[PDB]
Design a binder for this molecule. Structure first.
Ligand SMILES: C[C@@H]1O[C@@H](O[C@H]2[C@H](O[C@H]3[C@H](O)[C@@H](O)[C@H](O)O[C@@H]3CO)O[C@H](CO)[C@H](O)[C@@H]2O)[C@@H](O)[C@H](O)[C@@H]1O
Ligand code: CA
Length: 135
């Protein structure tokens, strides 16, 4: 069962929470990771299409579209490439077309574009974004 306002009560329920913020309250990737971990969780990992649908449904209920959200995507070693901050394997992927492109060699964190494509992009970790936690 999920904590109240993080999802449903069944044993198979996945628990995510959107944090959409104004520009003065958006966070870097590391700040967002630390925020979610302080609650006992982590930045959201998306391990399959079921989790993607869960998050998309939350976005549709939010009324806002096109927002950028930090996910738990962070580059590891050169051989690893992208990893999930929660330690789960990066099996499922939904990178946008051409991504990750490490544009100008400075993009080591992953963001979700909150539109129907639910696509991922690598971007400067120091950008201030919205974020999504999991527990
Ligand atoms: C593809 C992109 O390349 C770099 O970002 C460029 C930026 O791309 C926008 C794109 O125009 C927009 O349609 C899409 O929704 O978001 C992208 C940003 O994530 O466009 C500006 C000009 O407006 C610059 O050309 C940027 O270089 C790269 O930084 C992004 O990570 C991404 O791979
Ligand atoms: Ca990119």
């Amino acid at each position: 069962a999920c904590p109240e306002d993080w999802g449903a009560s069944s044993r198979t329920s996945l628990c995510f929470k959107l944090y959409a913020k104004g520009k003065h309250e958006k966070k870097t990737w590391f700040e967002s990771r630390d925020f979610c971990r302080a609650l006992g969780g982590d930045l959201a990992s998306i391990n399959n299409k079921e989790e993607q649908q869960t998050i998309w449904r939350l976005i549709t209920a939010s009324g806002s579209y096109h927002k950028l959200f930090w996910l738990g995507l962070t580059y590891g070693s050169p051989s690893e490439g992208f990893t999930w901050s929660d330690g789960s394997p990066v099996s499922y992927e939904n990178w946008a077309y051409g991504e990750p492109n490490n544009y100008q060699n400075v993009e080591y964190c992953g963001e979700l574009k909150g539109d129907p494509t639910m696509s991922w992009n690598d971007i400067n970790c120091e950008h201030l974004n919205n974020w999504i936690c999991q527990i």
